[PDB]
Design an enzyme around this catalytic site. Structure first.
Site, PDB file in Angstrom:
ATOM      1  CB  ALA A 125      -0.925   0.036   1.213  1.00  0.00           C
ATOM      2  CD  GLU A 129      -6.919  -3.203   0.417  1.00  0.00           C
ATOM      3  OE1 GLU A 129      -7.735  -3.427  -0.493  1.00  0.00           O
ATOM      4  OE2 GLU A 129      -5.988  -2.381   0.298  1.00  0.00           O
ATOM      5  CD  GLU A 157      -5.179   1.382   0.868  1.00  0.00           C
ATOM      6  OE1 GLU A 157      -4.405   1.605   1.821  1.00  0.00           O
ATOM      7  OE2 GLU A 157      -5.933   0.387   0.820  1.00  0.00           O
ATOM      8  N   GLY A 190      -3.132  -3.050   0.352  1.00  0.00           N
ATOM      9  CA  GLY A 190      -3.228  -4.263  -0.445  1.00  0.00           C
ATOM     10  C   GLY A 190      -2.668  -5.475   0.269  1.00  0.00           C
TER      11      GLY A 190
END
Lengths: 242, 243, 242
Positions: free
Chosen positions: C65, C112, C132, C109
């Site tokens: 991220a 998640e 983000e 990312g």
């Protein structure tokens, strides 16, 4: 009945100006008008919600009872309460509910309608509307069950007990607990951190978050991918990706 | 088989006790059926304001994990074994008055599922909970897969079912499986003490939040907010609001 | 881009690492598509009982991220999110439980991806976040949804809006990580836990998985319909008797 004070310039503090008491149907309609002007306003990025004075964000669980009316007037009074709570929840900018003391009943419901709750150590929260023969009317029965869980929601609505701020961070009702003399500073520092973040990334994160909670994962992921697209047609993504 | 005592300020609080300490207060087919009749199939009488549920003997609430290995017949009938557990967990869940599940010791298998059906769980310091059903070859079939994740979240629920372990009381309060933890000697008073606090408040305003909460957990915000506005008006049609 | 070892008691625990030590195990379209092949698109071989996902180097699970090499073509990210929504859908819906032994950085990312797993066991150095918005965009691979369904709306909003970076001590305080264990004892703790589920009945655990993974998106009554259907099937399966 209130004040609006913007400074950065992208953040204002909204202060409920009724220290003599508390949220009636007159200071709630005012709350609707103030948060609608911030929706169309482009030069504020986050919103700090707090109470005037130094002892209560809002105590509308012992000090305001128009409740001498028929049952039909209850629907209108609740509808006003749902609308103001809905307005301050779905507003464009993030909301920080600075709890400077008593936040009970309707006051807790308005604070719970905000995104982030940072409370003073000298703060008290709860839903004592069951001591007067009624359930929560402005959104307690649903929002409270969503932030802290069904377990702690049932305990706080059935008993109607008041709780200290420390046990609210324990159950997640507030996000941070900070000294009363340090509540304004810590809320501003969090506000500045969010303000420095991309407006479209945060504001569209809120839309996907305030709506993805009401559906399954698959439909919520659809809003996220639509949130993913909109921030891309924005120079904010490309400019900061360096 | 089971015991009920109705005794409080003008007899408002009822303490319902499962009576099987010989087999750790296990929950077989009959214990489910007999308990469902006690909660009168999703209603009660006006005298009771708060319900207290707790296994007799002070040793266990319901340890129906290792002492009822009767699942040896006809997977056809396994539907009606889960349906019976589904009915007993719904009846406790949707009963008119709040239920205070004062766990006292063991609560495993269906016993842990019985506690999760209640509204508030006050724990003893010697209590242990879990869903060891997977160690046998089955999931928790009495609502354990669904109820557990809605009280503690997805991370802790999945960890609990997959391993099928037992958690002590302080870690149940840490994840939210139990509302409060108190010494076993002082359990029944503290469980009682909260009951008179709930019963002292207006009865109708209590059971109407319960309807708006137990039904608003299964809908979006907009639908749940429309249920609250109906019980709120329901509570203005009665003298409790004005008085 | 990958490394797949499988050895255990009963030989059913498969260790899956992200192979990119020089880039803090960053997440691009090349490593995303392999992890989907690594998880064989919502299935596995019948030998594997438990899957452990971690990062190579013992210093970053996936710092994906903060891989910002996608600044073009808003149309050519619908698919980038579709790609990122497909590894999460494949890792979360794999037959056997997913245990994320996150080791150091796991952000956006990477974070998640961790939210796709059933169980997360972090370390003192494991620290997480969703920055983000500081880049100019919302989370795209399920961050706005999976974080809320794990830590609640109050802390997800705090994480997503600020895009700040929290330690493992408060990551377990909010439920983001199940357990926290020293940097010398992650894989061992992940293994012993992974053993604990592996030693149970294979049909029992994975059919719980289907009952919970699909049941978290429907009402209670429908969720109980999920459980009763899976419950009956296990009785037909021999592991229920012996």
């Amino acid at each position: 009945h209130m004040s609006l004070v913007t400074t950065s310039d992208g953040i204002c503090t909204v202060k409920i100006n009724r220290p003599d008491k508390a949220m009636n149907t007159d200071v709630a309609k005012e709350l609707i008008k103030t948060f609608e002007e911030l929706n169309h306003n482009d030069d504020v990025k986050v919103i700090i919600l707090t109470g005037e004075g130094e002892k209560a964000f809002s105590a509308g669980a012992d000090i305001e009872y128009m409740s001498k009316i028929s049952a039909d007037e209850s629907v209108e009074y609740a509808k006003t309460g749902q609308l103001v709570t809905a307005t301050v929840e779905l507003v464009k900018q993030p909301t920080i509910a600075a709890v400077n003391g008593f936040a009970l009943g309707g006051g807790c419901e308005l604070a719970m309608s905000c995104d982030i709750r940072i409370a003073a150590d000298t703060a008290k929260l709860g839903q004592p509307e069951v001591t007067i023969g009624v359930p929560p009317g402005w959104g307690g029965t649903q929002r409270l069950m969503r932030i802290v869980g069904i377990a702690k929601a049932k305990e706080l609505v059935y008993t109607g007990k008041m709780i200290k701020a420390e046990e609210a961070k324990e159950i997640g009702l507030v996000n941070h607990v900070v000294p009363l003399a340090s509540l304004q500073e810590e809320a501003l520092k969090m506000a500045q951190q969010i303000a420095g973040n991309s407006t479209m990334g945060v504001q569209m994160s809120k839309v996907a978050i305030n709506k993805g909670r009401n559906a399954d994962l698959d439909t919520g992921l659809g809003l996220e991918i639509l949130a993913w697209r909109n921030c891309f047609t924005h120079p904010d993504r490309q400019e900061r990706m360096t």
